[PDB]
Design a protein around this ligand. Structure first.
Ligand SMILES: CCC(=O)Nc1cc(N2CCC(N3CCOCC3)CC2)cc(F)c1Nc1n[nH]c2ccc(O[C@H](C)c3c(Cl)cncc3Cl)cc12
Length: 300
């Protein structure tokens, strides 16, 4: 009973729902097989991610998902974001079909690929060599910046940029997720800890936390936090600092320390992203160019 958009509409019978991936404030995500997503190959199978309402869904939950759907329609296609593939709005539950990223989010990707410590028995010529190398970490940071630059050009503010919301494909391509979400910025439980232990307040820019002001520069602040996550290999920001302490420390201008095995160039970018004045933080365009120089200088 939603209006039919033939541009995006996809036959729900061409979907085969599979294992649930996760749930969020107003919707849950399910992995599914899709047949003929490419109209040129009607019987071709592909793995997609389907977002839908829960079973305790209110009219507000539906409005948020519909709003998210329309946002994903408008923003367009970019390599470094999760793209809309199709929708199901006719004769059945509302489905929002988007791209798959096989390896999960960036935080879990990094944490599962930390190097082995000196308690492993040397076996092979690379027993001390881990899955993650410096140029790849820089690449991950570069791709997120380029994606954010794209979203900025489309006048889109993420409002909760984090490693948890960056997805990793089979080819280690970074794809920014959940950029068009209604997040209820006028009623944030700053003390609320997620089921995986995350405190989202630690990613908020000061103007967002204290003044409820969101700009693209507030996302830049979050990007700085995301930079810290990457080069801590999926570490949690402000280590061992409870929310109450975070409030006062931020008011005192406290910033995170330089993480171990992190070159000064990248901690430099982090601190620039954490400049008190939003205008003194780099733009995403500048971040892309800055990270590009580092990436090129380490990719011989
Ligand atoms: C489509 C291919 C696929 O399955 N991808 C996938 C699996 C997962 N998981 C989560 C962990 C899960 N393990 C299974 C074993 O027990 C521990 C959890 C394995 C599958 C997480 C993802 F982010 C993804 N990547 C996503 N691709 N496309 C998405 C669209 C929405 C989406 O949302 C969910 C709620 C999500 C999740 Cl589950 C984790 N981080 C961020 C997001 Cl936004 C994730 C993906």
């Amino acid at each position: 009973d939603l209006p039919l958009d033939p541009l995006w509409e996809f036959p729900r019978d061409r979907l085969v729902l599979g294992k649930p991936l996760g749930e969020g404030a107003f919707g849950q995500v399910v992995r599914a097989e899709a047949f003929g997503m490419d109209p040129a190959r009607p019987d071709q199978a592909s793995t997609v991610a389907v977002k839908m309402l829960k079973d305790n869904a209110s009219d507000k939950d539906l409005a948020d998902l519909v709003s998210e759907m329309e946002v994903m329609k408008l923003i367009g296609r970019h390599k470094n974001i999760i793209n809309l593939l199709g929708v199901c709005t006719q004769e059945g539950p509302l489905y929002v079909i988007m791209e798959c990223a096989a390896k999960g989010n960036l935080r879990e990707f990094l944490r599962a690929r930390r190097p082995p410590g000196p308690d492993l028995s040397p076996d092979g010529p690379r027993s001390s060599e881990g899955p993650l190398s410096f140029p790849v970490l820089v690449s991950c940071a570069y791709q997120v910046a380029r994606g954010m630059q794209y979203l900025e050009s489309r006048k889109c503010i993420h409002r909760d940029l984090a490693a948890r919301n960056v997805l990793v494909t089979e080819d280690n391509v970074m794809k920014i997720a959940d950029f068009g979400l209604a997040r209820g910025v006028h009623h944030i439980d700053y003390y609320k800890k997620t089921s995986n232990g995350r405190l989202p307040v630690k990613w908020m820019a000061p103007e967002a936390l204290f003044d409820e002001v969101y700009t693209h520069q507030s996302d830049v602040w979050s990007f700085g936090i995301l930079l810290w996550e990457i080069f801590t290999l999926g570490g949690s920001p402000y280590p061992g600092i409870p929310v109450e302490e975070l409030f006062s420390l931020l008011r005192e201008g406290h910033r995170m320390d330089r993480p171990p095995h992190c070159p000064p160039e990248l901690y430099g970018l982090m601190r620039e992203c954490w400049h008190a004045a939003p205008s003194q933080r780099p733009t995403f365009k500048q971040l892309v160019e800055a990270l590009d120089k580092v990436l090129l200088a380490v990719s011989e």
